[PDB]
Amino acid sequence: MNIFEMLRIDEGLRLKIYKNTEGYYTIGIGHLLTKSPSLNAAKSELDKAIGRNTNGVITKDEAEKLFNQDVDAAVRGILRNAKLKPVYDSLDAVRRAALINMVFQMGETGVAGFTNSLRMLQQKRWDEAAVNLAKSRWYNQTPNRAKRVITTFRTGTWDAYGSVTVVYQNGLPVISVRLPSRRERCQFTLKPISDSVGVFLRQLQEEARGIDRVAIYSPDGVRVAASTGIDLLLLDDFKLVINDLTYHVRPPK
Numbered sequence: 001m002n003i004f005e006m007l008r009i010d011e012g013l014r015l016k017i018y019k020n021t022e023g024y025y026t027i028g029i030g031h032l033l034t035k036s037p038s039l040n041a042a043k044s045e046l047d048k049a050i051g052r053n054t055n056g057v058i059t060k061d062e063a064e065k066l067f068n069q070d071v072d073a074a075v076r077g078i079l080r081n082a083k084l085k086p087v088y089d090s091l092d093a094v095r096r097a098a099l100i101n102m103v104f105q106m107g108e109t110g111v112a113g114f115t116n117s118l119r120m121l122q123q124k125r126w127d128e129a130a131v132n133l134a135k136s137r138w139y140n141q142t143p144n145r146a147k148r149v150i151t152t153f154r155t156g157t158w159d160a161y162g163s164v165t166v167v168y169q170n171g172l173p174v175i176s177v178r179l180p181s182r183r184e185r186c187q188f189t190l191k192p193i194s195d196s197v198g199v200f201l202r203q204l205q206e207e208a209r210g211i212d213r214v215a216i217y218s219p220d221g222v223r224v225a226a227s228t229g230i231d232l233l234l235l236d237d238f239k240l241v242i243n244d245l246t247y248h249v250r251p252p253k
Contacts, residue, residue: 001158003071003097007104009161010145012246013063013239015220017042017056021142028063030104031070060219074103083112087122098152106138121153130154144244159183164240166251173234173251175200179208180245190230197233198226215241
């Protein structure tokens with residue numbers, strides 16, 4: 001687990017233009033297109049960023065190119081900023097991920113404004129930083145994300161960021177799930193011959209008694225049918241929604 005998977009989770013993946021929680025036109029894995037309120041400006045800014053006429057739709061290959069760029073833009077952006085560098089330097093890989101996340105979301109100068117929190121951060125004053133971060137305009141606008149980021153700063157662990165993987169054992173797919181509180185994973189072994197997406201999903205609910213929503217979608221964002229066989233599901237990556245979090249699952253070919 002790392003910043004790339006962390007941001008996948010926070011940002012999801014959309015292949016058509018859409019408005020983020022701040023109402024700004026966005027595409028892919030949280031790629032901010034513009035701050036203009038004009039859709040046509042967004043649509044034009046899209047085409048330049050891709051290098052073809054997009055008609056407001058991109059592919060997964062195009063999504064992940066942008067993504068890798070924006071993160072290096074963020075991580076580089078950190079390293080050339082006065083306030084943000086020594087903190088970044090001080091922190092371990094996990095809290096550095098938390099910070100890039102913050103930059104990634106709201107830009108460099110947006111994240112310099114947290115002088116106090118950054119100072120507390122730098123001195124290793126975890127909970128103080130956390131308590132303080134929870135008082136920002138940030139937290140109010142995007143609360144549960146900020147909560148996830150703030151927890152990563154407090155603990156320096158991935159507790160708030162779950163994850164799902166698929167790995168074959170005894171020639172059978174085994175889906176481990178690691179939820180946003182319990183670093184005790186859970187695994188589900190499946191029979192692709194006979195089991196379906198709905199079976200897997202009913203299993204999933206019959207585990208945690210706190211889940212209120214579970215779904216599977218294509219990478220393109222389309223709901224996969226419950227009656228679909230797991231054999232077919234595992235021919236390609238997919239998105240597992242589990243309460244608010246969406247996880248990009250990537251079965252081994």
